[PDB]
Amino acid sequence: ETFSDLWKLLP
Amino acid sequence: ETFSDLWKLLP
Amino acid sequence: EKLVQPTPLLLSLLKSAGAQKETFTMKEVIYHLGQYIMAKQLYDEKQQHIVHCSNDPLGELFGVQEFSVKEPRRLYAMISRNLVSANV
Amino acid sequence: EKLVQPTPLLLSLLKSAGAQKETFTMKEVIYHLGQYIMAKQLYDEKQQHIVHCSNDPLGELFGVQEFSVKEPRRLYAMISRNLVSANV
Numbered sequence: 468e469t470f471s472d473l474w475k476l477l478p
Numbered sequence: 479e480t481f482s483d484l485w486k487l488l489p
Numbered sequence: 490e491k492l493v494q495p496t497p498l499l500l501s502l503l504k505s506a507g508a509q510k511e512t513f514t515m516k517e518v519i520y521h522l523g524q525y526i527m528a529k530q531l532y533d534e535k536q537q538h539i540v541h542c543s544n545d546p547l548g549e550l551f552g553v554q555e556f557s558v559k560e561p562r563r564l565y566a567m568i569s570r571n572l573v574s575a576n577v
Numbered sequence: 578e579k580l581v582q583p584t585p586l587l588l589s590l591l592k593s594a595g596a597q598k599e600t601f602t603m604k605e606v607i608y609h610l611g612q613y614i615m616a617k618q619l620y621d622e623k624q625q626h627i628v629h630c631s632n633d634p635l636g637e638l639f640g641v642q643e644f645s646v647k648e649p650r651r652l653y654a655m656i657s658r659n660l661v662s663a664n665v
Contacts, residue, residue, distance in 0.1 A: 468537065468538070469482065469537050469612075469615075470523075470526070470527065470532040470537040470538070470558070471480065471482035471483075471523070471527070472482075473537065473538050473558045473559065474519075474523040474526075474558055475523075477519060477558065477561055477564075478561050479625065479626070480524075480527075480625050481611075481614070481615065481620040481625040481626070481646070482611070482615070484625065484626050484646045484647065485607075485611040485614075485646055486611075488607060488646065488649055488652075489649050507622065507623075527615075528618065528622075530616065530618065534595065534616075535595075
């Protein structure tokens with residue numbers, strides 16, 4: 468899981 | 479559409 | 490959605506990440522912030538959810554050495570205390 | 578999937594992007610290459626599908642000044658001419 472992936476999941 | 483997005487779509 | 494007005498510092502980071510406005514929705518603020526972190530490569534090479542901002546203005550803005558994108562609540566609080574108006 | 582063995586140059590880029598092997602599947606090669614481009618910030622700020630590699634080893638490897646991630650066929654060809662074995 469890359470930064471972009473996590474950032475895109477921001478709840 | 480960011481680099482990560484496009485890269486992730488590589489066909 | 491509602492418009493928010495970032496403080497001068499938060500505004501300068503968003504602008505350097507390509508933003509052109511002075512008022513944005515929270516989604517634009519979040520989008521632009523990810524681009525800033527991306528462009529400056531502040532995230533950790535191995536544990537990519539950790540952002541190191543000890544020697545970057547983002548650290549001055551948030552007042553932390555680092556943070557995890559896996560802790561959404563603390564992140565939103567740091568952004569919120571940096572909006573002169575959460576309803577423009 | 579099949580294992581491929583990258584040439585010394587392609588290997589050094591993947592390694593610098595965090596790869597630990599010497600043999601990978603094409604998906605790992607593609608994954609590691611995106612990380613290299615990301616870490617070095619070779620993609621275009623505005624048109625993020627364009628990668629500029631004129632003064633980077635990636636340019637020496639591919640032999641181009643830039644390329645579009647929106648042209649999958651040319652990309653795979655550049656990678657392929659850089660595998661000493663497409664079946665290890």
